Every structure is written in structure tokens, then in C-alpha cells.
């Protein structure tokens, strides 16, 4: 699948743009979802920060949401809404050694909910972004808890899930 690389160390309102309108030209905005052969189903997106830790997104390209990410050696994915993405999210990060699957998806309300007190209106920014990065990076080893993850998916989906589908729409006016 195409990747689209970006990171946090020296990021400016420039860079941060042209990697949101890279992520929205990869769109395919549609209704439904299993429309698409899947190879042609996801996009990457490397993410990298000033501790130099990257992490890679899975990102659907008909809404443009995360499905899942991949961290060094081990992957993780969001419990799928049916059996198109169950077996579709199959086909991502295949040479990772490591691959789990959590039982709760990756809605806004769900991430909230576990988000519980640590979050109440979560702070958005190149340096939330920045940290959000590590977080997602340790979780795979043991130095992140559930709240502290879900607050970091958050940050993740809104500053470029949201961000792209927002620009595509408007696109279209």
C-alpha cells in the first residue's frame, strides 16, 4: 500500500498541510466498504517524532479512519465492524512477528469511555501529537495504560483521520 510519511520534529503549518492533502487525495469517500479490492483498501501513514519512535497507521481509504497500527514488531487493530474488514485488516503489516486484535472498536464514543478521567477535552497540537507517538510505541511494551492509549488514539484520529476527511468534503463542496 502507498505510504505517507511525516513527523513532528520541525513541523510546520506547510509540512503538517501537505501531509493532510496527501492523505485526502488517497481518498475514496463511499458508502459502504467492501466495494474495493483489498489491495487497494488501506493506506499507510508513518508517523515519527523528536525521540525519532515512529509508528505506522492503518488508515481505511473510504472514510479514512484508523483500523489499526503497527509499532516495531507488533501490530494491533481496532475489533472489526463485519467479516470484509475482519479479513481484510489480514492483509496488513504480514511481516510483523506480534498481532493482536482488541475486543473494543475504534469509535469516538468507545475511545472516550476508556479515555475515562484522564482526558476531559483533549489538548491538540504538535506536541500532543508528538507524545501521543510514544505512547502508541510503548504500549507494545508495557509502559502504557488503556486510558493514556485511548487519549493518544484520539489525538491520532482527530489531527489526521478528521483532518483529511474534513478537507475532502469541503472539497466537494
Same mark, same amino acid.
Request: with cysteine; charged share 15%.
Given at each position: 500500500?502507498?505510504? @505517507?510519511?511525516?513527523?513532528?520534529?520541525? &513541523?510546520?503549518?506547510?509540512?503538517?498541510? +501537505?501531509? @493532510?492533502? &496527501?492523505?485526502?487525495? =488517497?481518498?475514496?469517500?463511499?458508502?459502504?466498504?467492501?466495494?474495493?479490492?483489498? +489491495?487497494? =483498501?488501506?493506506?499507510?501513514?508513518?508517523?515519527?517524532?523528536?525521540?525519532?519512535?515512529?509508528?505506522?497507521?492503518?488508515?481505511?481509504?473510504?472514510?479514512?479512519?484508523?483500523?489499526?497500527? =503497527? $509499532?516495531?514488531?507488533?501490530?494491533?487493530?481496532?475489533?472489526?465492524?463485519?467479516?470484509?474488514?475482519?479479513?481484510?485488516?489480514?492483509?496488513?503489516?504480514?511481516?510483523?512477528?506480534?498481532?493482536?486484535?482488541?475486543?473494543?472498536?475504534?469509535?469516538?464514543?468507545?475511545?472516550?469511555?476508556? &479515555?475515562?478521567?484522564? =482526558?476531559? +477535552?483533549?489538548?491538540?497540537? +504538535?506536541?500532543?501529537?508528538?507524545? &501521543?507517538?510514544? $505512547?502508541?510505541?510503548?504500549?507494545?511494551?508495557?509502559?502504557?495504560?488503556?486510558?493514556?492509549?485511548?487519549?493518544?488514539?484520539? @489525538?491520532?484520529?482527530?489531527?489526521?483521520?478528521?483532518?483529511?476527511?474534513?478537507?475532502?468534503?469541503?472539497?466537494?463542496?
Amino acid at each position: 500500500y502507498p505510504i @505517507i510519511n511525516f513527523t513532528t520534529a520541525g &513541523a510546520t503549518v506547510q509540512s503538517y498541510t +501537505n501531509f @493532510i492533502r &496527501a492523505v485526502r487525495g =488517497r481518498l475514496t469517500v463511499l458508502p459502504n466498504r467492501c466495494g474495493l479490492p483489498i +489491495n487497494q =483498501r488501506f493506506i499507510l501513514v508513518e508517523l515519527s517524532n523528536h525521540a525519532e519512535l515512529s509508528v505506522t497507521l492503518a488508515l481505511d481509504v473510504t472514510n479514512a479512519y484508523v483500523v489499526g497500527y =503497527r $509499532a516495531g514488531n507488533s501490530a494491533y487493530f481496532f475489533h472489526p465492524d463485519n467479516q470484509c474488514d475482519a479479513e481484510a485488516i489480514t492483509h496488513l503489516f504480514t511481516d510483523v512477528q506480534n498481532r493482536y486484535t482488541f475486543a473494543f472498536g475504534g469509535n469516538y464514543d468507545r475511545l472516550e469511555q476508556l &479515555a475515562g478521567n484522564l =482526558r476531559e +477535552n483533549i489538548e491538540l497540537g +504538535n506536541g500532543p501529537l508528538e507524545e &501521543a507517538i510514544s $505512547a502508541l510505541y510503548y504500549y507494545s511494551t508495557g509502559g502504557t495504560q488503556l486510558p493514556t492509549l485511548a487519549r493518544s488514539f484520539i @489525538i491520532c484520529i482527530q489531527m489526521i483521520s478528521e483532518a483529511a476527511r474534513f478537507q475532502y468534503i469541503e472539497g466537494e463542496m
